[PDB]
Amino acid sequence: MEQEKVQELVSQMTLDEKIAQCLQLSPFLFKGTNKNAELTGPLLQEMKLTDAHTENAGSVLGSSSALDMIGIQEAYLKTNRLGIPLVFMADVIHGYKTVFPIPLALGCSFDRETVRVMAEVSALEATADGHHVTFSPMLDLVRDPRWGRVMESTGEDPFLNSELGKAMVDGYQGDASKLNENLEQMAACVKHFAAYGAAEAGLEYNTVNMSTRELYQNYLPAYNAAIQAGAKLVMTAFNVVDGIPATMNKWLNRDVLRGEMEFDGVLISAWGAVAEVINHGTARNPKEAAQFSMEAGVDLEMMTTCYIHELKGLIEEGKLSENLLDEAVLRMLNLKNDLGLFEDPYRGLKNNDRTKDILTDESRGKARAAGVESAVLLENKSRLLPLAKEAKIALVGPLATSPDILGGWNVYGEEKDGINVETGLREVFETVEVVSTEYTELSEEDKVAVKAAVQNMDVVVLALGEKNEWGGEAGSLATIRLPEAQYQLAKFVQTLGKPVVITLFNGRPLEVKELAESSDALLELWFPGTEAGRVTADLLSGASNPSGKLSMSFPQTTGQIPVYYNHLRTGRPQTPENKGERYVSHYLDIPNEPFYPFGYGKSYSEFELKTSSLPKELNLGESLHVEVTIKNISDIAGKEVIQVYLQDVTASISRPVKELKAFEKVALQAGEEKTVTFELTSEAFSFYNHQLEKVQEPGLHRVFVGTSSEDVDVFEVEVGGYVL
Amino acid sequence: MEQEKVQELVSQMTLDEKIAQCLQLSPFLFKGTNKNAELTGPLLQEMKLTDAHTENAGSVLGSSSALDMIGIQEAYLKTNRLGIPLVFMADVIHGYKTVFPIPLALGCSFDRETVRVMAEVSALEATADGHHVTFSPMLDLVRDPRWGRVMESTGEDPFLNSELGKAMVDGYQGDASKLNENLEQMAACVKHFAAYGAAEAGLEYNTVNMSTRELYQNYLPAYNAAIQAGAKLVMTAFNVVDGIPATMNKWLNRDVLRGEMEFDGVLISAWGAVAEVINHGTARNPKEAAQFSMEAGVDLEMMTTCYIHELKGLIEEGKLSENLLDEAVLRMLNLKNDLGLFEDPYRGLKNNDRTKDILTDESRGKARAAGVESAVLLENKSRLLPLAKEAKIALVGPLATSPDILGGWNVYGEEKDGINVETGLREVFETVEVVSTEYTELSEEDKVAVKAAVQNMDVVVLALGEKNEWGGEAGSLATIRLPEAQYQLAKFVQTLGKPVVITLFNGRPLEVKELAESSDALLELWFPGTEAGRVTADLLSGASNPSGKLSMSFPQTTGQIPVYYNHLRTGRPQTPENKGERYVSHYLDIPNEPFYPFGYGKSYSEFELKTSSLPKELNLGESLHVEVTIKNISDIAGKEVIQVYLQDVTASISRPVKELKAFEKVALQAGEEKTVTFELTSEAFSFYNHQLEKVQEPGLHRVFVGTSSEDVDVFEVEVGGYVL
Ligand SMILES: OC[C@H]1O[C@@H](O[C@@H]2[C@@H](O)[C@H](O)[C@@H](CO)O[C@H]2O)[C@H](O)[C@@H](O)[C@@H]1O
Ligand SMILES: OC[C@H]1O[C@@H](O[C@@H]2[C@@H](O)[C@H](O)[C@@H](CO)O[C@H]2O)[C@H](O)[C@@H](O)[C@@H]1O
Ligand SMILES: [Mg+2]
Ligand SMILES: [Mg+2]
């Protein structure tokens, strides 16, 4: 409906109606829900919620199905005085019912279109079950694999994260200005603003601290890119930002998000974060929490009651302007209008059962394709892989038969629809003998059974991994290792004298040195989702050819953290030339290098790259155009990820040794050759200075073209002169 | 001499003379040295140094003895045109020839007077060998025991560090305005400005980053306290501070150090740090390095040549003001005048051999006393300790006979004068049987020998530890554990069925859970210095009673780092109540608590404390006066460390759960009772806000009185009203 009519609604609402519009609740706190009704009475009483609250609530969080939504919405519109529909929001993180790989695995794809497709299918399915908003993408930069939430990020590089962030928004939303018409697309909500990934010691919800310049340089760019691409909502973070909980941080949310980033949508709190500023010790009570959160421009309080119980008295007593409340309500109403809820509150569902769109075979093919783009081949000694379909396989370990392959942050997908490793392999391989072991134990009996199976077969597929519950939210590990029983299992299998491929399933970087040394091949599958076993079988048999690259560094050991490719040089860098000396930046007990670096991954193919002549000089403001010819010089079709990095050799701030500024994943048949071109705009050459200005300085840059952050040719470009 | 005459010298100097005044060199780069003279020609050529450079150099770094000094200074004053004497500077970190405990161990003393004495004796001896300046105290706050340089800090608390930092300045300098008369005292140089201890991943020289507010709140206060107490010099740090290498950080060194902290002495570079800004990528070349370092106010370049080879051209071309040079030269001359060098350039030595004053028995008694104050008794199950002098002792392990007990940063002390553990024990105990093992191995032959010795005796003294070379500068360990052979040794010794005391010698916090669990008692000796074996024997026999408390947290495991007592609460704290739930700040695999906390330490005595009635309310600006009565309720004389912490419950910045604000180490005879009083001024109640103002806010504080950061009684005080 027209804007005038939206403003009209705001004027017509009572104060109590406006306050409750800023509250989000679980579905079973509403009448008309069709699940968990036994939770409703107790919990309404505990939150001290009344009908006047729930009949005017603004939003539902985590509806369980289309029927739940329809029922809740129908009952609510019966009794709502002005006919304002609820908006329904959900966590669709890496798929709805068709589960795609976890985001960190999608990071390893280096493939924008893979990520857009995941987001499209997610929305197709989620809208079919009546969800309007997804709490994705998660764009927290991560340098610390202790933190369980790395699984939800695309990794340690802001440029990659920004690019795949944009891809996800485009896939969920399509043309954002048509979300009232395109009812198979949904609103995206960027999270968690800001810098949540820098949690001290990888500990969940823990202190975050960095300079404002670093915040702007590394931690903000990905949220900013997704906002500029049209993300409709933003969610606050649990952590402090320079000492102030993000949720009531007026500088962060008013000056930066609403001011500088020009964000004019709904700012929704993370779960309970408005009430938690009390625990943080920056509000005395819920009256203060409410006041400060509203000052900071939080429109929507998720599942706490600070707003509903305190706003009235704050507005009555004059501590808080009613104008701040009206602008929140107006943003909530504009969101609903943007989704077409005032013309169709059932968002396409009321006379249209869209069950048919959920968990289709076409969608499964897409998740499989996503799986095979995202996996990373870390070792393959002696061309052990791909296996022949006649290879006789002993398939052993805790991930042999585990149905736990869908990943963390899988709120709607079901393990029964998932394909485990055994099932996947037996579709492809005629002889498989299986010995499943426990996640945290290695018994004598297991060793006997494993030994017997390996004696029978020709090659071992050792399937190791984490339970998904060892990561995700509030799954912090001080030591980033598998249970020791799995390292013992790999050591045992090695002694049997048969070639061993390790297929590793996990949600974070781990200490894998002992796995690489105990096997001939090592494949990082992460958690591929619904098609897990087929993803694995096709990569092992060569039906698909591994093409993923690490989007996060794999530490030598836990105490190397944080280690990441885009690091500063320091004043005493270790060089090939000073190897050995005491007074240089090094550890006495490990290498400075991570075990595996950013952008690293193997292939069954072999490629050669050639960069065309680059200029020696460039004007300020000028783009550098980078042409690369790549040839598949093997007999196997495959894909390579061309990566381009820039370094600022001398600057007024000590700049990273490399930063990724472009990438493209190129598919090549045997013998095929292609040319791709990149444009590094003058923004790629810029950075934040000690004064927090985005600047471009004259001087020397190096340009790295290659297939990892380490496997590169280097070129020099002197920037100066006049500005374009 | 008169200030006017000092100025006169500056006017009389040529440009080349002024430039060279800002250079510091090793002694064997001068004519007249009496050691390492064969290094002189090659190195002079490599640095491309001439006589005109060395005959006008401003300072000598690391003279080897009084004779080296006298010789160098005598030859130099022969040829120097205006008669400006050299100033001689050295690393006297925890003693000269009489070696005291490493600073981190001195932290654990919680004893201001112990620290002042160490500093007094250090200066007595160092001045006797002709040094004018010491590069101490090191006041870098440390939260990361991977970093080898934690040994040189007093630990994780800014208040403790500030207080002992002041004690060290007073001990070295005495009345700073009389350093021309008191020739047994010497100038102190505060280091490393600033925040060097926050090196990322505990990696030497590595990136430092934190908000400016945190910089002020936690990282600056100890340098500031030592500057205000009258420290004559400051040394720059190796690291970046918000992206700019400290050495050329104009904001840091001009605005903060010279402006806000009102420091008007010599700013000396850390070793090579002026040249190393090039490596950091914030200067293109040595011409830029010089220009920027001088702009930032660095007066004295340590052992690099940027200044001498580039200042002339910078001044000639007008890229740098000659006035900046003259003020550096004037600060250098004022330092020399403060030390009386213009009346006596040999600073008391020329007709007075003070060999007499070095390594006296009185001094040894003081280092022993320091040792016994600083050790920390971590476990003592079943009153194993103290041992009777008739106890028959198996003394085993790598520290049984090792002479490596003087600590890191022992530039002048000699192992032959040290007392090892065996020697110390046999002065006290009639029966000791010794089995020495290696630091990194545990052989079958060792086990047989250990077994035989333990069977013969009644109690095991298991002496475990680090070589000093595993810490100090550029001794970063990614995993903070002893060599695994020592853990295996402790496990083996435990199976022998005899009571075990572990005496642990080390320069950092270590993972000691496996030691505490494998023994009945555990004594943390750190590196006590020259009197090590006697420090150990006296504590073991009860001749002295352990009284140290930890000045740094001991992590459950490496991946808990950083862990520290003064932490933020977060938005989802673990409580007694919610412990068990998923969605709280916790690790899946370890406790949140460190293994041992700040301020923790045992005693052979037992004490009780009672805090007198506190007010319920306080005005802004008002001091809180805290009276504590402590009684020794045992039959053993000993010392307790009374600690007082404050918390700011609610603030505009999320404030730590506790901060130490006072402490006193109280000595009590059996049955004795004392009353001590503390004043927590309104500055103890203050903090830096989001705008970097030092503020006091009205509201609730809690006051904790006790004997650790955990063992405390808690009291509430409501601050508000008017201001004093
Ligand atoms: O689910 C919406 C957003 O909120 C958080 O998940 C909450 C968690 O913080 C809370 O403790 C539990 C209690 O039931 O529910 C979860 O829903 C996540 O941190 C957000 O990413 C999520 O989008
Ligand atoms: O000793 C003067 C100051 O120098 C640094 O020590 C240097 C070290 O950086 C350099 O690598 C070696 C070269 O041999 O000399 C050492 O003396 C220390 O970090 C400062 O704390 C010290 O006060
Ligand atoms: Mg540059
Ligand atoms: Mg307060």
Author numbering:
A (entry chain A), B (entry chain B): 1 to 724
What do the study's own words say?
The structure showed that Lin1840r forms a dimer of identical subunits each composed of three domains.
The electron density of Sop2 was clearly observed in the D270A structure on soaking in 100 mM Sop2 and fitted only with the β-anomer. The fact that Tyr583 and Arg572 are derived from a loop in the adjacent subunit indicates the participation of both subunits in formation of the catalytic pocket. In the Sop2 and Lam2 complexes, the angles defined by the oxygen atom of the glycosidic bond, the anomeric carbon atoms in the ligands, and the carboxyl group in the catalytic nucleophile are 165° and 164°, respectively, as in the case of GlcNAc-MurNAc in a nucleophile mutant of GH3 B. subtillus N-acetyl-β-d-glucosaminidase and Cel2F-DNP in BaCel5A. The anomeric hydroxy group of reducing end glucosides in Sop2 is exposed to the solvent, in the vicinity of Asp91.
